Amino acid sequence: SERPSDLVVNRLVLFVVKGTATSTANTVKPLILLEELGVPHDIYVVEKVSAPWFSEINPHKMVPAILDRSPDGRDTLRAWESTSTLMYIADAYDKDGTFGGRNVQERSEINNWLTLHTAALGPTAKYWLYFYKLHPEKLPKTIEKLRSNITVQYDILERRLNEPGQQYLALKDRPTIADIATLPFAMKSTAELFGLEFEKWPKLQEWSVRMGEREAVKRAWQRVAGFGHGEKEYGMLE
Amino acid sequence: SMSERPSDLVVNRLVLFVVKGTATSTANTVKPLILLEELGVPHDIYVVEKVSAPWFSEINPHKMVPAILDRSPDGRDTLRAWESTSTLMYIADAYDKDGTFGGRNVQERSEINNWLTLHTAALGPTAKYWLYFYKLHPEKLPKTIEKLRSNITVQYDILERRLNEPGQQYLALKDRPTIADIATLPFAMKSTAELFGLEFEKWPKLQEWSVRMGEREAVKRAWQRVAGFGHGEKEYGMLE
């Protein structure tokens, strides 16, 4: 119909935009999981999220989005909303439940902390960033209240990581899609952007550093910054 | 622990934590209750007097209803669910073994999670922030209230477009309602639209969908029960 010629779905295709300091907070999430699990995937750099062909993939017209083959390879499926892309990759490629949860007990906590980010810190940070930069008029009282609500979320995450042996948000033993979803909005660089002293949440800061030291996380940050700055600017990367 | 539970809080089955039924207290707690009614899951109702009570904050650190305590599958331990979307995920995982509401395969689940997460991330928080700034915030911020109201119409537009697709009777799947539909319904029905100061008739397929969902016996039972909690023989604690 209206898809670009280079949009081929032979394996998982992760839709992103050109890498900047402000454009990668959400697209890095599925990329971290793909790197952790070693999932074969392509990167598609979307020039215009407003493009009609892209709205048929994601009606919310934002990155990240995924196109992928169905398990039997006879059909195509889609994932959109960053949390949904994490849930999809876990469902399709994490059958052992290393990042998705191995049992009902593990999944119960993973979904609690994943949903907390999806419903509270995620949208609050999104609205803060909107009213701070994007909104034509400046509403500083609304900006301050959203800033305050971020500290309330940081307080909840700090208290969780102060529980005995609770090294990660969901599970004590290893990171999950809950940790991956939270990390971009709960690290020193993002705290400085909000105008907050991240040192006020010591266990949360320690957690962000521990997550940051993971090879998959380092590779994901490096790659997501680079997308659209290579020999090919837009479309399917080589 | 540092907090003591009430003597009447025992977990012999799934316990759904709610507050006294009011116009503004039921929009989230009704979601897991709809799914419990659909699947015929044996459950208790616990009416929370004070969501800031230490014992309840140890169940849900976000200090809100709904929350769930349940026995682990083997019945040796207890587990918890909190955030209304997380409670739907948990009930589906533990009790929807044939995937009727949770999705039967990766393909069904891919769409269910898309529309479930859209609500959890977009309409849900936007509606909550509108409600906050409208009647909870000490000061009136009309420019903020206006933008949030505008953002609700954009979300209604997305749902309307989806339900205008050929044979798309429900948000995620064409054939049947899922946890995606259950999560969305309370924020996409006429009474809630009228609360936002919007004309719900302007989204006709979304209105038809909300009526179709509303005609389900499980949904009718859930709405009746959630309004009545804490107004029966017992005001607070474990209901009979």
| Alpha-carbon distance values, B199 to B122, B133, B162, B169, B236 (Å) | 20, 21, 19, 22, 37
Check CB contact under 8 Å for B93 and A71. no
Provide the CATH number for the domain formed by A104-216 in this structure: 1.20.1050.10
Deposited experimental method: X-ray
- Cis link prior to B32 (omega < 30° from 0)? no
CA dist A135 to A60, A139, A224, B144, Å? 19, 9, 26, 10
Distance separating the N- and C-terminal Cα atoms of chain B: 28
- How many helices (H) and strands (E) chain A has is answered by 10, 5
- Tell me the CATH number of domain B106-219, given options 3.30.70.270, 1.20.1050.10, 3.40.50.300, 1.10.287.130: 1.20.1050.10
Minimal Cβ distance to A107: which of B82, B93, B126: B93
Contact B9, B67 (CB under 8 A): no
- B58 at interface of A, judged by CB pairs closer than 8 A: no
Any chain A CB within 8 A of the CB of B156? no
Contacts of residue A96, Cβ cutoff 8 Å, sequence gap at least 6: A102
The end-to-end CA distance of chain A, in Å, is 24
How far does A222 lie from chain B, in Å, by closest CA?
Answer: 27
Judge whether A103 is closer than 8 Å to chain B, CB to CB: yes
Phi first, then psi, for residue A82 (nearest 5°) are -55, -45
Which residues of B participate in the annotated binding site? 28, 65, 84, 128
DSSP B6: P
Task: Establish whether A126 is an annotated binding residue.
Answer: yes
> What is the widest separation between alpha-carbon atoms in chain B?
56
